[PDB]
C-alpha cells in the first residue's frame, strides 16, 4: 500500500551534533583550506551569497582578503556587473565570482563577465534540477570549456548527478533553508539541509566535485555541521548581511542599528508576482573581518574537538549524533540571564 | 499484550515536505485542472467551505469565475438557499454547490436546491462514517440517481469506502483539522490530515472517486501537500474568510481590519449546547481574485519544482520527506526581522 | 551493553488521538454508566480529587447528584471528616468517599469514617507501590472485609498487581501528571499518563478490577483518551477547582475571578519540608453542574464519533493514532483570533 | 551508503523519566553516601564547579560541611589558590579540591596545591580527549602516584577509556550541557548529557572508576537522572551560583536580587578571543545549606519512589522511560497560575 509516498526522514542542523574525538589538533593549528571547485582553492570555507543586500565589489574584496570568495549579484547592468568583477581583480589579484541566473539571453552578460576576468560563474536557480537550467549549463560549458561553473540549487542525489553530467565544476545545495526564504511554505517543497548536503555529496564525492552548502547557516556551529555532512564550503547570506562592507546604509530603528536584507525572490528584489522570499532588516554587524574571525574561530574549535586536522578530515570522517528538541535546548544557553552579548552568540 | 491500541503514527502538513525533481514544467505552464467529482471538472483545485462566514452567492460567483466551486451554506431558509444557488447559475453559466447536512427532514431543502439548478449537493456531517449519514446518502442517491453528491467527513480508509458504497460522487476528508475547530480537543477524536487524505485516497483511487481535502490549509504549500497526499482538490474556510466577497462587514479593531469567521459547530452558528468550534475574527484579505492568484502561484511553483505537469502527476507521483520540528522552523522565515509582509506569507 | 536502562517509550494525552469509526451511536443516546469499583457503579465516569481546594461535602453532594462520587479530603479533624461524610449520606442517599492516606495511626479515622457510612475509602499515597502503603491496605482489608477500598497511586503493571494482591477494590493510576504537581521535576520520577493507565489496566482487566485515571485531565477529550487507554473513570482536581461548590471564596485579581487551588504536597497544604506541589489559583468556573454537562458533552460526542455505545466499548475497543507536535497544534484552534471563549475551551 | 555519519540518537534529562518501583525505602532513611573517586567518599553526591563565580574557600567550606566537596578555581595566583585550599583544610578537617586546567607550565601550581594539602586535583579541559590533556594527566600521575586526580571532560566511551588509561581516579563527563555554555552552538560539537554519562559509565564501571556528571543540572530531578544514568555524583555551577557563599556581591536589578554567573570560557573570565561561554546573572538563592537540603530532598524522594536504598542502587538498577515533548510538559506544573514559588521549583 504505502499510499503516502514518503521517501525517508530528513534532518537539518538543529537535529544533530558532532561527536568529540581523540585529537592532536589545536584550534590555532587547524588547517582551514579547502576547495570551491575542482580547480579553485579557498583559504577558508566561506563564500558570500549572490544577493543585492550582501555582495558587490566591496564585500567581495574584504572576503577574498580573508580567504573566501564573493559572488557579485546580477541586479545591475551588464556593464556595472563587469566593472564590479574588474574592481575585485585589480584589488591585488583577488578571486571573484559572479551570478547570472539561468534564463535565456544571458549570453552577453556571461561574455562581459568572462572578459572582465571572473574566476567562477554561478548559474543559479531556485530549481537546479530544471531542464532549462541543465541546458544553460551545457551550452555555457560548450561555449567556455575552461570556465569554472557552479550550478545549483539542488537538494537530492539525482539533482547533484544531473548537474555534474551537465558540466558543473561544483554543485550548490539548498532548496528553501534560507533565512529570508518562504519557498517551503509557499510551495511545500524542500529538503532539510543536512540531509540535502549529504545526499548531494554522496554523488559528487564520486567525481571529486565539491558541494557548496547554501542557506540556513545561522551560528558558526552550523558551518561545522554543513562540512561534516559533506560540503567543501558554505554559502551565507544573512551571516554577512548587516556588515559594514555589505551593500546599503545603516538604518537606525528603535535604538538598534540595521541594514536591509532581502531574498532575491522578494517582490522588491524582483522589481502580479508571487514571491518566494521576504524583505527584512538584519542587525548591524560591524566589519566583515571580525565576523569572519569569530565564525572561523568556532570552526577551528570544532576541528580541535573532533581531531580534524584539515577540512577534508571533518568532511569525510567526523561523526554525528542525532538529538531531540530537548537536546537542542540544552545546547543553547539556558537557565541564566545573559548580561553581555558574546560576539559569536547574538540572539537579541 | 499491546494494551494501548495504537493503530499507527499519523502525519499532518508540517510533518512533511515535497521533494524537488527533474522538471520540464514551468510555473506558468503548469496545468491546474482537476476533478471535484467524477463528472464535474474544475479549472483550479479549490472549493469554498459551506460556512456562513465564508460562502454565499457573492463568493461562490467570484470563485467559480476563477475556476473553483463554492458551496452555499444552509444557515438560511430553503427559499433563500435556492435563490442563492439560482443567482450563481444566472451569473454566466457558473457551477455552484449547496450544503444540506445529514438530519432527517432535509428532503424539501434538497428538492428546492435541485430545482434551482444546483450542480452538486453536499451532505456534510462532522461524522461521515455515522450510519445516519450513510442512510441519508443512500436515500438521496435513490431519489436523485444523477445528482452529484459529495459526502463527508471521514478520516479513514473504511470511512471512504462506506461513503463510496453508499453512492457518493466524491469523499470529503477531515475530522478536526480546521482553524476554528475544537473537536479534537473536546472529543479526543481526529486524524492528522495528511495521513487522513492518503488513507481515504488509497480506497477512493480504486473506484476513480476524487477526495476533497477539507480543513487545516493555512499556506499555499499546504495545498500542494494535500494534493500530493491524494486529494483532487482542497476545501478551505479560513483562507477565504476575510475576503471582500465573503459574507459580513469589515470590522476595525485596534488598528486592524477583520471579518467574522466562525465554526458551524460554534454556539453562534448553531443559534445547553456543547460546541465543537469557536467564534473568531480573521484578518481582512481584500479581493478573492488576488488571494487565489497568490495561492495558485504557490501551487504552480511547486509543480515546477516537482516536475508535475498536471495535478494528477502531483497527486500520484510526487514524493515526500518526513521532517522534524527543527526542519519546519528552517522552512519558515527565520533569524531576520520582516519589514514588509509578502502577500502570500502574512503572519502578523 | 544497553548501559542506559530505558524500559520503553511512554505517551501521554497530547501524543495520541482517537480514530473515528462506524457508528450507530448518537451523542445523546450514548450510555455513560461505568464502575468505580467492582461493587460501586457510577452514572458518569468522573470522581473528584481528595484535595482541600476541591472536595468537601458541598462539592461531593453536587457531584453525586450528577452521577459521580466525591472523595472528602483529610486535612480536617476526624470528627469534621466524619460529619462531612454523614452530610453527603443524608442529602438523599448519595454515595461518598473519603481519603485517609497511608501513615500508621489512621485506624481511628478509618473507624469514624466507616461508621459515618462512607461508601469507599481511599488509601492514597504519592507512592502506592511503597511497602508501607501495601501493608496498610492489607490491614484495612483484614479489618473491614467488605469495605470498598481504592489504593494508589501507581504507574506500572507491577504496581497495579501489588495493589490488587493487597486487596484493593480499584487501582488509582498516576505518578506526577497533575496540574499542580512538581514530583517529576523535583524527583525525576514519573510515567506519562496514557502509558501508565494502559499498563495498569492490562493487569487489572484480568481481575475485573477498575482503574481510576488520576491527574492531568485538562480538556474533555483527555477524559475520552484516559478511558480508551483502559480507565473505567477519571479523577480530576483542576477541572473542578474554581467551581462554586469547591471549597474557598472567589478572589478577584486583575479583573479576573479565581479560587485557590493547591497540591496536597504543597508547603501550605502540609502545614524543613521539601514540597512536591505548588499553591496556585484557578479561574472561577461557576456551577459544577454546567462544567459537568460540557465535559460529558465532549465524551458523548467522542462516543458518537467512535461508535462506542457504552463506556466499556470505548475502554476496550476504540483505537488510537500516535501524533507529532505538529499534529497536536493542528488539533487546537489555530490561525484565527478567538472573539468569544467557548465554555468547553477556555485557555485565557 | 549512509553518507550521513550518524553514530546513534542521544538523550538528555528532559527526554527521560525514572520508573517508580516496589520500595521499602523512605525518603529520610535513604543513604546518600557515594564516591567522588575510588578513594574519596562523599556523604552527598554533589560537587561544586571550579568557576570564579561559584567556588572559593567560603563555598567549598559550606559544601564540605554538608557532605560534598568544592573545587577551588584557578583564576587567581598560585599563592591565593594554595591559601584558599589551606583555609578549607584548617576549617575542621574538611576535604577540598582544586582545578588547574591542562596547559603546560602548571607544575608549580600543582606543587603548591599538593603542599597546601589539596585532597583532589582537577585537571580540567573543555576537551578531555585532547592528547595534550592525556599527556598532562600521565605526567601528573608519574609525578604524584598517590594524588587523586579527576580528568575531564569527555562525552564518549572512548574518551572515558583514554582518561582511565592515562591514570585518572575519576572521569568527569560533559561537553556543552552547561547553563552558560555556547560550545555546542559555536562549534557544533556535543553529546546530550544522559547519553554521555551512560556511555562513559559503561567503561568506567569496568574499572571501578566513578563518573562525575558535569553541567546541565537545573532541577533536583536532574540529579536523580544523572545518577541513574551511571554517575556517582554530579557537578553543578548554576545551582550553587547566586548562593550567599558563592563569590561576588548581590546585585539589585529591576526589583530582583542577583549574583554574577559566567562561563570560564567567557570573554570576562578569560581576561581576539573566540568565547565558548557567556557572562550573566543568576537569581540570588540565599544560603547554600537550604539549597542543598531542597535538592537532596528531591533525590531522597526519588530513592523512595524507586526503591533505591543507596546511591549504587539508583546508579545501577533504576529504570527509565523515554518521553516526548508532551510528556515533559505534563511533568511541569501546567494549567494553573502559581501564587507562591516553591523553594525547589523557582522558574520566574
Ligand atoms: C536564485 O536564488 C535563489 C536560490 C539559489 C534558491 C531559492 C530562491 O527562492 C532563490 C531566489 C529566486 C529568484 C531570484 C527567482 C529566479 C529563480 O526562480 O531562479 C530557493 O528557494 O532555494 C535556492
Ligand atoms: C458539518 O460541518 C462540520 C464538518 C464538515 C466537520 C467538523 C465539524 O465540527 C463541523 C460542524 C458541526 C456541525 C455544523 C454540527 C452538525 C454536525 O455535527 O454534523 C469536524 O470536526 O470535522 C469535519
Ligand atoms: C496523596 O496525594 C498525592 C498523590 C495521589 C500523588 C502525588 C502527590 O505528590 C500527592 C501529594 C503528596 C502528599 C499529600 C504527601 C503524602 C504522600 O507523600 O503520600 C504524585 O506525585 O502522584 C500521585
Ligand atoms: C574547563 O572548563 C570548561 C569545561 C570543563 C567544559 C567546557 C568549557 O567551555 C570550559 C571552559 C573553557 C575554558 C576555561 C578554556 C580553556 C579550555 O578550553 O579548556 C565545555 O564546553 O564542556 C566542558
Ligand atoms: O527570495 C529568496 N527565497 C528563497 N531563497 C533565497 C531567496 N533569495 C536568496 N535565497 C537563497 O537563500 C540563501 C541565503 O540564505 P541565508 O544564508 O540563510 O540568509 C542564498 O544563498 C540563496 O540560496
Ligand atoms: O465548528 C466547527 N468545528 C469543527 N470543524 C468545523 C466547524 N465548522 C466548520 N468546520 C470544518 O472546518 C473546515 C474549515 O477549516 P479551515 O479551512 O482550516 O478554516 C470546514 O470546511 C469544515 O470541514
Ligand atoms: O502536591 C501534589 N503534588 C503532586 N500531585 C498531587 C499533589 N496534590 C494532589 N496531587 C495529585 O494530582 C491530582 C490532581 O491532578 P489534576 O486534575 O491534573 O489537577 C490529584 O488527584 C492527585 O493525584
Ligand atoms: O564558558 C564555558 N563554556 C562551556 N562550559 C563551561 C564554561 N564554563 C564552565 N563550563 C562547564 O559548565 C559547567 C557548569 O554547568 P551548569 O551547572 O549547567 O551551570 C561547569 O562545571 C563546566 O563543565
Ligand atoms: K549549553
Ligand atoms: K526558510
Ligand atoms: K483544529
Ligand atoms: K505535573
UniProtKB/TrEMBL annotation, chains A, B, C, D:
Chain's role: Catalyzes the conversion of inosine 5'-phosphate (IMP) to xanthosine 5'-phosphate (XMP), the first committed and rate-limiting step in the de novo synthesis of guanine nucleotides, and therefore plays an important role in the regulation of cell growth.
Known catalytic reactions: IMP + NAD(+) + H2O = XMP + NADH + H(+)
Family: Belongs to the IMPDH/GMPR family.
Matching PANTHER family: INOSINE-5'-MONOPHOSPHATE DEHYDROGENASE, INOSINE-5-MONOPHOSPHATE DEHYDROGENASE RELATED
PROSITE patterns: CBS (PS51371), IMP_DH_GMP_RED (PS00487)
Record keywords: CBS domain, GMP biosynthesis, Metal-binding, NAD, Nucleotide-binding, Oxidoreductase, Potassium, Purine biosynthesis, Repeat
Gene: guaB
MF GO annotations: IMP dehydrogenase activity; metal ion binding; nucleotide binding
Catalytic class of the enzyme: oxidoreductase
Annotated positions binding NAD(+): 124-126, 174-176
Protein name: Inosine-5'-monophosphate dehydrogenase
UniProt-listed InterPro entries: Aldolase_TIM, CBS_dom, CBS_dom_sf, IMP_DH, IMP_DH/GMP_Rdtase_CS, IMP_DH_GMPRt
Organism: Vibrio cholerae serotype O1 (strain ATCC 39315 / El Tor Inaba N16961)
Binding site for XMP 1: 179, 181, 183, 214, 216, 237-238, 261, 264-265, 276
Superkingdom of origin: Bacteria
